[PDB]
From a paper:
Here we introduce the first crystal structures of the [name] endo-levanase [name] (EC 3.2.1.65). As typical for GH32 family enzymes, the [name] comprises an N-terminal five-bladed β-propeller catalytic domain and a tightly packed C-terminal β-sandwich module linked to it through a short helix. The distance between the nucleophile Asp41 and the general acid/base Glu221 in the structure of [name] is 5.2 Å suggesting double displacement mechanism of the endo-levanase reaction with retention of the configuration of the anomeric carbon atom. For [name], respective amino acids are Asp41, Asp169 and Glu221.
According to sugar-binding subsite designation as recommended by, three ‘minus’ subsites and one ‘plus’ subsite were specified in the active site. Since this carboxylic moiety is missing in the [name] mutant, the neighbouring Gln239 was found in two alternate conformations partially filling the artificial void. As the strongest proof for that we detected no levantetraose bound to this module in the crystallized protein – the only ligand molecule was found bound to the active site pocket of the catalytically inactive mutant of [name].
Author numbering: 14 to 508
The structure:
Amino acid sequence: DGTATYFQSSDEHGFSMYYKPQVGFVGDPMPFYDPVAKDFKVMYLQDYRPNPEATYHPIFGVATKDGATYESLGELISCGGRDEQDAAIGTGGTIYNPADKLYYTFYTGNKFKPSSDQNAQVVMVATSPDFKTWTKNRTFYLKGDTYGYDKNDFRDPFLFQTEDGVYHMLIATRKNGKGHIAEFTSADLKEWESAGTFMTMMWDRFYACPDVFKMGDWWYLIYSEQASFMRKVQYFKGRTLEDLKATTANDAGIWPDNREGMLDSRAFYAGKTASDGTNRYIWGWCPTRAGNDNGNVGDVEPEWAGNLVAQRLIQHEDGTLTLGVPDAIDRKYTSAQEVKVMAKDGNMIESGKTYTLGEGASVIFNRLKVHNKISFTVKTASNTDRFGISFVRGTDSASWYSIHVNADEGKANFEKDGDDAKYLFDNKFNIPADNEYRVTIYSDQSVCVTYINDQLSFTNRIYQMQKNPWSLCCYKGEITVSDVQVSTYHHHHHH
Ligand SMILES: OC[C@H]1O[C@@](CO)(OC[C@H]2O[C@@](CO)(OC[C@H]3O[C@@](CO)(OC[C@H]4O[C@](O)(CO)[C@@H](O)[C@@H]4O)[C@@H](O)[C@@H]3O)[C@@H](O)[C@@H]2O)[C@@H](O)[C@@H]1O
Ligand SMILES: [Zn+2]
Ligand SMILES: [Zn+2]
């Protein structure tokens, strides 16, 4: 704690709040509020590095009351045989049927090397009375082309029941080349009728992992954009279901806010929600990086799967959504640590427990631990200033990794700083009029989420942020840093 040199830390210690199974990684999650157990069941596609040919992504599960503590459920729905329709499983959705007291999980069966007459993707279902033993329904095969949709893109079923008792299933597919979310209705979850297109997908986009829900006086669609330049979780909103569906009708592009509904950036994907009646949370995954290299974020798309991340939905008075930390996660960080300056550079002053940094100045703080909570307040002199939050920055580090907050650009960027500096990706968010940024960062080994002013929610993979110093800097203008605090998970030091 008295040195600030770079240390080659690892993820082997283990994750807690941003869950990873002992073997493999967390792919698309399928969260569900279990109304009998009164907790969340998060099914997810289990990823291995490498996966088998043909038979991959079985559905595993974890249980959580709150998004911070997880109990593994192991393998719940296994892959089919190499030649079967669900040789590989894709994402779906779970729902409880009070009439027969069965949990139903609809999923995507991906056929290995389909023939011209076969369907690459078909929706299938499994049921369970207790969420431990699941029985595949060997007679249920929902094919898109039966209803005018696509034979090979027909996936990610989302199930919900409306107040009138009707069950709805939304499926991401195509019709005449264009992306369509198709709707099916049922009284009993067994016999399904097509209700046509729920919503079309903007332009040539494709909305994976759709999720529709009502929260307060607004209806929402949350989705994950497949297009390579986006790869982010986004949403639309409407006061009525018809208003929601109209946001994309005829490519209207009625964005819900001033940032095209982009909730997070490229290190949080496949996000879907569930509510316990008090809060609605969103679960997605944070990708791994090839070679554990924080600056290798994929040439086209990032690696698929990684760690499970939960965030809380914040509904604003105008109906827009931002994401915040789940309250139970904010409580895993218990012992406040001492914050000490280990190095200063450039044009800056230390004034007690505040710091003023001019253009080009940096301050480096003492080493973080393994699971961290970092909080501070930044006041900039102008609404065009720029400052940085840097990790893995040892006094001897040639390069490091930073969240750049660019007020003149209306966004935060994740970048590599120092030698071989390079921009990686960004995250638009509302800039405060009073130039005050209340920052909180929650980390679990290599996974962290940065929150600012209940407006920015920025997940990042930062290998080796643990057990290494962190830093604040000013790139443009002048900033004053206040109320710096750091709290930790491990804290069991008898003194
Ligand atoms: O080729 C197999 C090989 O590819 C990976 C990703 O590198 O898995 C992709 C395949 O998984 C499948 C079935 O499990 O889909 C899973 C779900 O993923 C979703 C959203 O995350 O989208 C699939 C979509 O992901 C891409 O990688 C995006 O470009 C596409 O390849 C693909 O269309 C969701 O919509 C799916 O349900 C299967 O469909 C994918 O091809 C590896 O893990 C795997 O080993
Ligand atoms: Zn401990
Ligand atoms: Zn630990």
